[PDB]
Amino acid sequence: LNPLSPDIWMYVLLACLGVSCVLFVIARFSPYEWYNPHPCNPDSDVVENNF
């Protein structure tokens, strides 16, 4: 791992953590990520999550 100074490793790790977390948070505010699993039977509009 020598070429990259340990600084960038920790910054990239924190950036990955933050982007994944904010993506998950947006999933809560995502309108369409709810997808009532197995929509072959949309008879039941079971509001179910994703992401």
Binding site: R28, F29, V47, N49
Partner: peptide
Amino acid sequence: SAMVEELRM
């Protein structure tokens, strides 16, 4: 109400 719906889960 929608905020509560999608937060309380």
